[PDB]
Design a protein around this ligand. Sequence first.
Ligand SMILES: [Cl-]
Ligand SMILES: [Cl-]
Ligand SMILES: [Mg+2]
Ligand SMILES: [Mg+2]
Ligand SMILES: [Mg+2]
Lengths: 291, 296
Amino acid sequence: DLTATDLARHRWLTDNSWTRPTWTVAELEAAKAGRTISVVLPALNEEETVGGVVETIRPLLGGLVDELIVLDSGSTDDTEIRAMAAGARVISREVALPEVAPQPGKGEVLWRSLAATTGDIIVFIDSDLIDPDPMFVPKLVGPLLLSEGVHLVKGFYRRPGRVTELVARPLLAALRPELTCVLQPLGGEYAGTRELLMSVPFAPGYGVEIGLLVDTYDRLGLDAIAQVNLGVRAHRNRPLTDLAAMSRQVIATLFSRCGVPDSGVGLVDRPPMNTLRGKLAAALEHHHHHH
Amino acid sequence: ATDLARHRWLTDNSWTRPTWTVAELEAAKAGRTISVVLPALNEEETVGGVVETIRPLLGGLVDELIVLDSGSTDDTEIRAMAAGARVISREVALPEVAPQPGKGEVLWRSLAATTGDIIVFIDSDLIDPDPMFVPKLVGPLLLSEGVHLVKGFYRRPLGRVTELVARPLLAALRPELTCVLQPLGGEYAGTRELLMSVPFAPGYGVEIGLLVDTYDRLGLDAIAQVNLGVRAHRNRPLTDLAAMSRQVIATLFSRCGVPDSGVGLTTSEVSLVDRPPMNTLRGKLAAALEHHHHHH
Ligand SMILES: [Cl-]
Ligand SMILES: [Cl-]
Ligand SMILES: [Mg+2]
Ligand SMILES: [Mg+2]
Ligand SMILES: [Mg+2]
């Protein structure tokens, strides 16, 4: 028999998931209604791929996309100069947020990018993608521009993911089962409103994606979360040591959000950016637990 | 200082090259008896091969050799019996308790169908069993003091649930237990004193539940591990591994008091309900098995 989780998933997929997100660039630009869109590529030593990702987004710059930033995390290869030649604005962690010393990890980069961007919508795309497609950004922003109440859009790939299927999804089933409807909770391609992203803490390192997903859910529920199919992509092979470290941080971040203490046996969470920037901006929509 | 604790446990409680002979282990039994239990559900292709590696010990080191069948419809029972095991159904093991599915149920029920002071569990689906498995698993129980649970591990040629799920969760919630190389392994031996007195987690949670309960109740030095040899990882489909992971999570959460929704993976089987210590249902058997000097 269907569970409450099953029923919620069915209707959430009907309303908030797009397998064929075929909005046109023209109709999305027309829907902006004065809102601006920033695209951020976090990057650490991605010289072979960063230019290719920038190249797929560059045609939107000056139309759908208002700024295209590579937030470099201290590369020692040619990541930064290749991003420049490909047509992006390269900003370091230190320039993005001068008053806070950096610490390692991807979450730090995305958090700092909130201070370096101005868009009402911020889109994150990994800089290590081997086969980026030019429609990633349109598909990610579609629900934010057209679907009332959506604040976070997760881009997923159809397959022709061990941490996702063995760690993230089973832990969500135990701790936040409604979120098992999200196909790829750890995915690096996603978009959010400034109102949402400035109001939540950012988990460090490999925990950033899952932390944003759970913080959004705990604040707004499933209604605020959407997902879109970015296309067919094969799984990329990562070393087991990388996967184990990713798993351990996914666990730590889930535990910190879900009331589970953690030994610390294996970086700190950053506070909402609205404690440092945009301090008087309008608050994220209320979602009351009392009446 | 914490890696120091793990390093010292490895020095005293882990054996990469157990030296023990069958003869020296028999000489050390000192009146203790050993029961070997193989859980089996539809393992006709491998069960006989596993039994054949243990059968030569029967009447010497090993006092009984049982396959606990969970309702096979293939030729598991006849092949196990032909190879020299006594085949016991779940119903025979514990007749007045209705069976429920999963591996934990089978191991728990076997406690009511055995008499050993030591119980050794060996999986019946092993493709490459070796006759020294039982000797290696019982070595620390017979020759060391204070050991109650011995976990058999395999060196790998130079799994994902262990490295991505079990070990990182133990780092978070029972940090000393990351010293155990293969916490989910199905080859292990325990004392009657331990096994008769702990609840048994259901299904794929049984191994980690026993490990954590032993750690909490009896301590790190009550756990040991032994290398059974080099074996390649077995290829299991991702949906099986994900279901196993979900139950490992549920059982660990149960042992920590973390509220677990009980919701499976789109739907995999998840149970949050243990079986109670067998000494509650077989009190006279349990008391008969308790050594006269237990509380002395
Ligand atoms: Cl993954
Ligand atoms: Cl495994
Ligand atoms: Mg990289
Ligand atoms: Mg313009
Ligand atoms: Mg630099």
